[PDB]
Every structure is written in C-alpha cells, then in structure tokens.
Amino acid sequence: GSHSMRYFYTAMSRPGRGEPRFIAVGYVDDTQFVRFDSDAASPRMAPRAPWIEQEGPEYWDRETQISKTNTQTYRESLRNLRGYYNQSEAGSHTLQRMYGCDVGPDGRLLRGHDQSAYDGKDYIALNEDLSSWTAADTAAQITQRKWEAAREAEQWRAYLEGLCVEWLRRYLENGKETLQRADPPKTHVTHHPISDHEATLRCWALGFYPAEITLTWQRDGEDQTQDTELVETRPAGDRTFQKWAAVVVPSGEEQRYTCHVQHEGLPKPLTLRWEP
C-alpha cells in the first residue's frame, strides 16, 4: 500500500586527492531511480530505472544543476563542519543527508524526513512538524542557528508537502508495473546435520520485493528470538531480496519447529516446516 521517496547524499573529503566527492542517489521504496556523482567523467543526474527515462531535458537539466550546486555547497559545508569540531585539515570526513516523503495507499503525505550525519553520527534532523530542528551537539546547534536564520525548515516543509508527494505520485503511476507490484518470497526450509544429535534448520525467503520481511522460528509455538540466527536482508541483483533465519535443533525434534513468514506480497502470513 504505502510508499516512500528518499534521496541519499554523501559528501566525502579526501585531503590531497582533490575536492570532496558528492554523490546523490534517489529511491522510490527499494528501487533506485537516479544517481549523480561529482567524480563522473561528465557529471549529470542519470536514470537508474526505465520508468524515469521518459522525463524530458528540462527534468534532467534541473536535477543536474541542483546536484552541481550541491557539490559546491556540501564542500563548503564539510569545511564548516571540520571547523566546528576543531579538526585537522589532514583527515577525511563524511557528511550524509537523507530526506524524502512517505505516503499512504491514498497518495497523501504520512510524514516528511530530512536528517544529516557527520562521520556516521547523527548531526541534525528536521522534526516531524517540518518546522523545527533537533541538533545532536553544540556544533549542530551552529548549523541549526544558520538554518533558522535562512528559514530552511519552511523551504523543506514546502518541498516535502508539495513537489515530493506530487512527483512520488507521478513515479508510482509511471512505474506502476514494478513499483506497485509486491513479489512474495519463495520459501523453503533446509536441514543440515551438525552432529549426531543436532541439526540446523534454515528457513529461506527468496525473490521478494520490497525488502521489508519478517522471518521467525517458533519451537512449540514459542518464538525463538534469542536462539535464531537471522542474516541481513540482501539484494539478489534483479531488484529482489533474500533472507534466511536459522535455528539449531535436537535431532528428531525438527517437527516441533515452524518458520513464519510475513511479507506484503502475502495475503496471510506463511507457516512452513522442514519437509524430508
């Protein structure tokens, strides 16, 4: 039902190796659809999904210019941030920003987001009100003061409630055969003896989209959270995702264990067992 659009900016300094690299990537849900990289032979916002290719030159020109402007702004920002933390000119540092909008089945705004991090630590975030900020430390308070003075929150609210939702809706229509199609996991349980008295049961979910999924093991109907090995959801490379959950069980007790799968592509949760 619900959908999100997100942009991810990464600016990385690299003293002695040129000016900071700026990359911007845009997603609808788990589908990347645009990318800009300041290191490219010829930097421009470029399509990464077929449904965005139909946008005209005016579109690509706007996005390229914004991204070239950002390349410069984020460089100046990294210099400011180095100063705020009294850091050496010799070290490399990273500034990240993630922003965008969430909409429900009816296409209406659920909420907007704009958050930044410096060297992997939260730095400043636009609050859910789209009008005020939460600064992580005294450095970020300096940024907050600048942003307040520049009426940045007003600009973000206008974007998040306006263009963000409008264009997300347009993308969802233009890419409706994929963006609005949930592919359910293909599920199966494998069995791997460890010893004469224990075996691993591994419950697999393959070929699903979007990435969000829940895989849990129960023993006699009791959840096995602490005793489950759950790998991170990983991309297959064909838009879909994979995940598994494993539990070590006493030999001959395999039928007491059930794997439970929830995915938006499934009408009702699935229960599976090892089928020898």
Binding site: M45, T69, K146, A158
Partner: peptide, 9 residues
C-alpha cells in the same frame, strides 16, 4: 524530484 538547495551547514 530533488529537494531544495539551501543553507550551507
């Protein structure tokens, strides 16, 4: 479509 350019940090 992209968000708005704005204040340096």
């Amino acid at each position: 479509i992209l968000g708005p350019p704005g204040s340096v940090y």
